[PDB]
Write a protein that binds this ligand. Structure first.
Ligand SMILES: *[C@@H]1O[C@H](CO)[C@@H](O[C@@H]2O[C@H](CO)[C@@H](O[C@@H]3O[C@H](CO[C@H]4O[C@H](CO)[C@@H](O)[C@H](O)[C@@H]4O)[C@@H](O)[C@H](O[C@H]4O[C@H](CO)[C@@H](O)[C@H](O)[C@@H]4O)[C@@H]3O)[C@H](O)[C@H]2NC(C)=O)[C@H](O)[C@H]1NC(C)=O
Ligand SMILES: *[C@@H]1O[C@H](CO)[C@@H](O[C@@H]2O[C@H](CO)[C@@H](O)[C@H](O)[C@H]2NC(C)=O)[C@H](O)[C@H]1NC(C)=O
Ligand SMILES: *[C@@H]1O[C@H](CO)[C@@H](O[C@@H]2O[C@H](CO)[C@@H](O)[C@H](O)[C@H]2NC(C)=O)[C@H](O)[C@H]1NC(C)=O
Ligand SMILES: *[C@@H]1O[C@H](CO)[C@@H](O[C@@H]2O[C@H](CO)[C@@H](O)[C@H](O)[C@H]2NC(C)=O)[C@H](O)[C@H]1NC(C)=O
Ligand SMILES: *[C@@H]1O[C@H](CO)[C@@H](O)[C@H](O)[C@H]1NC(C)=O
Ligand SMILES: *[C@@H]1O[C@H](CO)[C@@H](O)[C@H](O)[C@H]1NC(C)=O
Ligand SMILES: *[C@@H]1O[C@H](CO)[C@@H](O)[C@H](O)[C@H]1NC(C)=O
Ligand SMILES: *[C@@H]1O[C@H](CO)[C@@H](O)[C@H](O)[C@H]1NC(C)=O
Ligand SMILES: *[C@@H]1O[C@H](CO)[C@@H](O)[C@H](O)[C@H]1NC(C)=O
Ligand SMILES: *[C@@H]1O[C@H](CO)[C@@H](O)[C@H](O)[C@H]1NC(C)=O
Ligand SMILES: *[C@@H]1O[C@H](CO)[C@@H](O)[C@H](O)[C@H]1NC(C)=O
Ligand SMILES: *[C@@H]1O[C@H](CO)[C@@H](O)[C@H](O)[C@H]1NC(C)=O
Ligand SMILES: *[C@@H]1O[C@H](CO)[C@@H](O)[C@H](O)[C@H]1NC(C)=O
Ligand SMILES: *[C@@H]1O[C@H](CO)[C@@H](O)[C@H](O)[C@H]1NC(C)=O
Ligand SMILES: *[C@@H]1O[C@H](CO)[C@@H](O)[C@H](O)[C@H]1NC(C)=O
Ligand SMILES: *[C@@H]1O[C@H](CO)[C@@H](O)[C@H](O)[C@H]1NC(C)=O
Ligand SMILES: *[C@@H]1O[C@H](CO)[C@@H](O)[C@H](O)[C@H]1NC(C)=O
Ligand SMILES: *[C@@H]1O[C@H](CO)[C@@H](O)[C@H](O)[C@H]1NC(C)=O
Ligand SMILES: *[C@@H]1O[C@H](CO)[C@@H](O)[C@H](O)[C@H]1NC(C)=O
Ligand SMILES: *[C@@H]1O[C@H](CO)[C@@H](O)[C@H](O)[C@H]1NC(C)=O
Ligand SMILES: *[C@@H]1O[C@H](CO)[C@@H](O)[C@H](O)[C@H]1NC(C)=O
Ligand SMILES: *[C@@H]1O[C@H](CO)[C@@H](O)[C@H](O)[C@H]1NC(C)=O
Lengths: 435, 123, 124, 123, 123
């Protein structure tokens, strides 16, 4: 046909790409780091566009992970270090009324701390959780802080909230984010109801293990997502289509006192407890949870067999940070025992521990001291998904709560988004020639 | 009227009428990540504009050239390419030949500029 | 089936004007170029004017270039021709025809695919 | 001749002869502030050059277009506008219609560019 | 063909066939240093493109103007400039006169734009 090459600029095509995204949105996150969000939800549906997604090869997860860790470290860096408190403690039993489940959990410790002046010392009394102290043999002491033998303990800055707030990860111009608006989306493979957005809906950096809190719900049915469901070494992300409300509390009324440990420094500690001492706990409605697991096994049988028995069991062992359900509540860190939720074959109260000196990730060499919060803490949150691991062990599959790899927490979200690079240039044969 | 990339699933013919809809969307310590992203957006825009300049297509969105289609890059007729295909499918179909086509376009302009210069040198 | 039916007028005095209108059906009007071709009562065919598929471009024979205006309305699927300063030499049957041009992304034509019944235009 | 904005207070018909004077002055940790300032200046420049490209005005300082002037945008006569008014007063007067005008300019080029392609496709 | 600067030692005529080879290689604390390098490269590119635009040479690598050559700048004939001479030697000779030529190019284009505007205003 005597066709000629015609060059078109502004062609609606793209290629998969990895680029640097920026965030948009008294707090760890979105202090000054993030750009004010454009309030207009400029979402464009792409009719007849099928896009292949892979939530386990999504570089937005790696960027979200690095951004959260970086912001966490930036928040804690300009704060009071507790190296002057790495001294032996004289600890005795708490003299208040202790319930059966709190015997030895909390101890009344005393120590000689520094003051505003280098040449002075003060005797300080405080209540520490057993998890935060370890035995030591010394002259006039019994225990020392658990992290002083590993790394410096940094006190979190007071009045800087750890509450997760939605963060929007937005693409630079020349790039676009595609969303998969597909009900019951597998999390991998072609997605027909693709749409283009400038950026995400606002993802809360909620940190938890085993149970996914304050996330997004499935549009119609529970969705089982796994990189390779056959391989038991992979974690399974279960997105629920209904929330399960979990009510977590620390009923003790804490009286919080503070001391100076140097010029301009301050250390916060629990001074005493008002009322009886009770164990922290979470209440999960029994009927709702039973229906939730019924739905989960109903979905699992599609991959494991219509006639297979599915069993749930508690975690297999290891560090508290991964064997229990870790979460932030009111600024406090709860480590709840989930064996009451995953103990079955196909009101529930879960006891919880509180730990003030924590390692936020698997990395070793850093530690943070979470200051106590005055009063009584009660949180109401939605369980929106589960992290499950399949037992290696033949029939009757056994599932357990998963771990704390964090990427799983940031794959429950960001599984429907892909970043693509726009390629405005293209060529095509036309009948048009110069002159 | 469909917005940025709204024509992505439409045929090449229909999509060719929305070039300006998305062309405007190519330009528009934590400071470094955002600043680098802005610089990269600028570098990609400028590389595409420079490439259009090399081909003699500066300032145009639909630029006709003097390079013939050789029927080996793709042997589809215009009816199938423009009425029964999208730009994503076309881009995939001739991806392996884009560097060849771009090279020919550069060579074509190099000859054309000399010809214009020679025509302009006649009194 | 494709139909083109002219609904234009008849006899006009020299120096006046006459508008022709062609109703098209059976095909997508906006996908084809349109033209007017005339035949004097005792002669062969003569091309008069051509309009593109979108209507943006028009072409005429020099003998009518400053007198005839060709236009289209793609919402009503009609083609119009306004002939000013009619001359005795313009007496002819005027046929509405589909074809004559392709809008760059279409295969080539340079021929006329469909012809209408034809309106008879006379000048006193 | 008069300076960077020397013609700012002059009438439109005089200031329009100094367009190169203003055009040449649009391009030229503390490093972050300096880089953001330079990147922003570049981004604004490119936004304006892209917009001129969309309208078919790339490479020109005085670009004539095919968009008719609407008497509802400004009902002043041509002599009054160019002989008795400055560009600042005009910019204020036409501010509420600038985006309307820009939209029409884009539409005009989109039609013209397709029309040019069709003229070029005639053998 | 000869590489990025392969024609650097060739005569001015021969090196005029490689303008795209050099043109396509102009665009492509550690973060601050990398950003300053990228921004500076972009600013140099844009200043040169703006300057070409001011002269009416936007989108071209070889551009012919209406400014006559003054023998006071160089009185060598074409057989001594386009042959038997390289671009480096020429740049060494046309140093003190570069700003004069650029000023004349700007003025010539300003006159060209006003003349085109007046010609296009004739009905
Ligand atoms: C999942 O999401 C839910 C919310 O959807 C979270 O629950 C919220 O958690 C935040 C933070 O813990 C709660 O905010 C706190 O509320 C306290 C009580 O607020 C009451 O009183 C005030 C009086 O002004 C009313 O405005 C308000 O509506 C309530 O009636 C405040 O006292 C807290 O402020 C104190 O602590 C913060 C610490 O950051 C300091 O900055 C303040 O200065 C002050 O000392 C704080 O505002 C919020 O109320 C909870 N919501 C609900 C509905 O209960 C879950 O925690 C979240 N889950 C996970 C795992 O992230
Ligand atoms: C932790 O131990 C300290 C030291 O015994 C207790 O503080 C004393 O408590 C008695 C009452 O039992 C007071 O009369 C003293 O004046 C307190 N001394 C100081 C230095 O504070 C403290 O009450 C104990 N706390 C708990 C919860 O058992
Ligand atoms: C969570 O609670 C369960 C039940 O209290 C604990 O399971 C017990 O673990 C011990 C470990 O030595 C076993 O001897 C018991 O037989 C288990 N009990 C039951 C009923 O099976 C579990 O260890 C607790 N986990 C955490 C992390 O605290
Ligand atoms: C600023 O305004 C003054 C007048 O107030 C301009 O100067 C003269 O104005 C009269 C008005 O009739 C003109 O005829 C003269 O030609 C103007 N003088 C010159 C030297 O041109 C003055 O030019 C205005 N300034 C600017 C920068 O435009
Ligand atoms: C403290 O409580 C623990 C609980 O197991 C008990 O074994 C211990 O003897 C108690 N010590 C004192 C001094 O009361
Ligand atoms: C002290 O640190 C070492 C090295 O990290 C560790 O092996 C040891 O268990 C720690 N001490 C206690 C009492 O846990
Ligand atoms: C929990 O789910 C309900 C569903 O209606 C919703 O209204 C509520 O806001 C959710 N709560 C949280 C904390 O996400
Ligand atoms: C969907 O997910 C399952 C596991 O949930 C996986 O085996 C399968 O390959 C995925 N892809 C498709 C197209 O079903
Ligand atoms: C999943 O893991 C099993 C382990 O035996 C392996 O054989 C299979 O190929 C893996 N599948 C995928 C899709 O990676
Ligand atoms: C949990 O349930 C128990 C049932 O006895 C109740 O006493 C307790 O107050 C509940 N706690 C919360 C936080 O809902
Ligand atoms: C409640 O849990 C038991 C566990 O054995 C199960 O058999 C029963 O069907 C569940 N009931 C529901 C989901 O209504
Ligand atoms: C699991 O449930 C059974 C009763 O069905 C109970 O005997 C057993 O102790 C429970 N295990 C855990 C770990 O809660
Ligand atoms: C704790 O006790 C103090 C005693 O003064 C009281 O003011 C405070 O309100 C109590 N807080 C709670 C949460 O019961
Ligand atoms: C999607 O395909 C349908 C097929 O009938 C078509 O009508 C529609 O216009 C296409 N969508 C787009 C955005 O081109
Ligand atoms: C284009 O080619 C296809 C076969 O690939 C054929 O069916 C179709 O009719 C051809 N169209 C034209 C207009 O030649
Ligand atoms: C001018 O604007 C008015 C606004 O009502 C519109 O009706 C009119 O058609 C426009 N005219 C032109 C020539 O653009
Ligand atoms: C322009 O309008 C003004 C309004 O006062 C009038 O005085 C002037 O004569 C008009 N000029 C022309 C050329 O129509
Ligand atoms: C633009 O619109 C505002 C609306 O409040 C009006 O006040 C202003 O006068 C308008 N400007 C012009 C130049 O018409
Ligand atoms: C260098 O000079 C020789 C003649 O001495 C010539 O043949 C050769 O082509 C020149 N090289 C270049 C790169 O122009
Ligand atoms: C050439 O340059 C000289 C420099 O002194 C100047 O005097 C002369 O007028 C210029 N000639 C032209 C034709 O521009
Ligand atoms: C150019 O000038 C040189 C000066 O030496 C002379 O030899 C040569 O012949 C001149 N060439 C022409 C073509 O006039
Ligand atoms: C430019 O001026 C300087 C002034 O010192 C002079 O030395 C140099 O030779 C001049 N350059 C040319 C090319 O005439």
């Amino acid at each position: 046909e005597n066709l000629w090459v015609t060059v078109y600029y502004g062609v609606p095509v793209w290629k998969d790409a990895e680029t640097t995204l920026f965030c948009a949105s008294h707090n760890v996150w979105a202090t000054h780091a993030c750009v004010s969000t454009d309030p207009n939800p400029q979402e464009i549906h792409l009719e007849n566009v099928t896009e292949e997604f892979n939530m386990w090869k999504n570089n937005m997860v790696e960027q979200m992970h690095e951004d959260i860790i970086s912001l966490w470290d930036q928040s804690l860096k300009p704060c009071v270090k507790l190296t002057p408190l790495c001294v032996g403690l004289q600890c005795t039993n708490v003299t208040n009324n202790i319930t059966d489940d709190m015997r030895g959990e909390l101890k009344n410790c005393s120590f000689n701390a520094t003051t505003e002046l280098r040449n002075k010392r003060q005797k300080v009394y405080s209540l520490f959780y057993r998890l935060d102290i370890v035995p030591m043999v010394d002259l006039w002491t019994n225990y020392r802080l658990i992290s002083c033998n590993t790394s410096a303990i940094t006190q979190a800055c007071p009045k800087v909230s750890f509450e997760p707030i939605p963060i929007h990860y937005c693409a630079p111009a020349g790039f676009a984010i595609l969303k998969c608006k597909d009900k019951k989306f597998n999390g991998t493979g072609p997605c027909q109801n693709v749409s283009t957005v400038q950026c995400t809906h606002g993802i809360k950096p909620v940190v938890s293990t085993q149970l996914l809190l304050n996330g997004s719900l499935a549009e119609e049915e529970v969705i089982i997502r796994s990189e390779n469901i056959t391989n038991n070494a992979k974690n399974i992300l279960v997105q629920l289509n209904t929330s399960v409300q979990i009510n977590c509390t620390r009923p003790n009324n804490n009286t919080v006192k503070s001391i100076r440990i140097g010029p301009g420094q301050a250390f916060y500690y629990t001074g005493d407890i008002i009322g009886d001492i009770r164990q922290a706990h979470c209440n999960v409605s029994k009927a709702t949870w039973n229906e939730t697991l019924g739905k989960v096994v109903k979905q699992l049988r599609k991959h494991f067999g219509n006639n297979t028995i599915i069993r749930f069991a508690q975690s297999s062992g290891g560090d508290l940070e991964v064997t229990t359900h870790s979460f932030n509540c009111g600024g406090e860190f709860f480590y709840c025992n989930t064996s009451g939720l995953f103990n079955s074959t196909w009101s529930i109260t879960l006891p919880c521990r509180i730990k003030q000196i924590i390692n936020m990730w698997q990395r070793i060499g850093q530690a943070m001291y979470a200051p106590p919060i005055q009063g009584v803490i009660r949180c109401v949150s939605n369980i929106t998904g589960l992290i499950l691991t399949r037992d290696g062990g033949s029939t009757t599959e056994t599932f357990r709560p998963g771990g704390g790899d964090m990427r799983d927490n940031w794959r429950s979200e960001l599984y429907k988004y892909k970043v693509v690079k726009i390629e405005p240039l293209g060529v095509a044969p036309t009948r048009c020639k110069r002159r | 009227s469909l917005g940025f990339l709204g024509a992505a699933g439409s045929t090449m013919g229909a999509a060719s009428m929305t070039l300006t809809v998305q062309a405007r969307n190519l330009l528009s310590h934590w400071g470094i990540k955002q600043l680098q992203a802005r610089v990269l957006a600028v570098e990609h825009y400028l590389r595409d504009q420079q490439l259009l300049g090399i081909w003699g297509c500066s300032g145009k969105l639909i630029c006709c050239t003097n390079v013939p289609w050789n029927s080996s890059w793709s042997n589809r007729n215009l009816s199938e390419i423009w009425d029964n295909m999208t730009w994503l499918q076309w881009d995939k179909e001739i991806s392996n030949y884009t560097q060849i086509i771009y090279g020919l376009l550069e060579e074509s302009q190099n000859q054309q500029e000399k010809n214009e210069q020679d025509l302009l040198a006649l009194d | 089936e494709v139909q083109l039916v002219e609904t234009g007028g008849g006899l006009v005095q020299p120096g006046g004007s006459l508008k022709l209108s062609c109703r098209a059906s059976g095909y997508t009007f906006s996908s084809f170029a349109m033209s007017w071709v005339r035949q004097a009562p005792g002669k062969g065919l003569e091309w008069v004017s051509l309009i593109n598929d979108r209507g943006g471009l028009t072409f005429y024979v020099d003998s009518v270039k400053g007198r005839f205006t060709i236009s289209r309305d793609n919402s009503k699927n009609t083609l119009s021709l306004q002939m000013h300063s009619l001359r005795d030499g313009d007496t002819a049957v005027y046929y509405c025809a589909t074809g004559g041009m392709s809008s760059a992304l279409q295969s080539s034509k340079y021929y006329f695919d469909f012809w209408g019944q034809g309106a008879l235009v006379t000048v006193s």
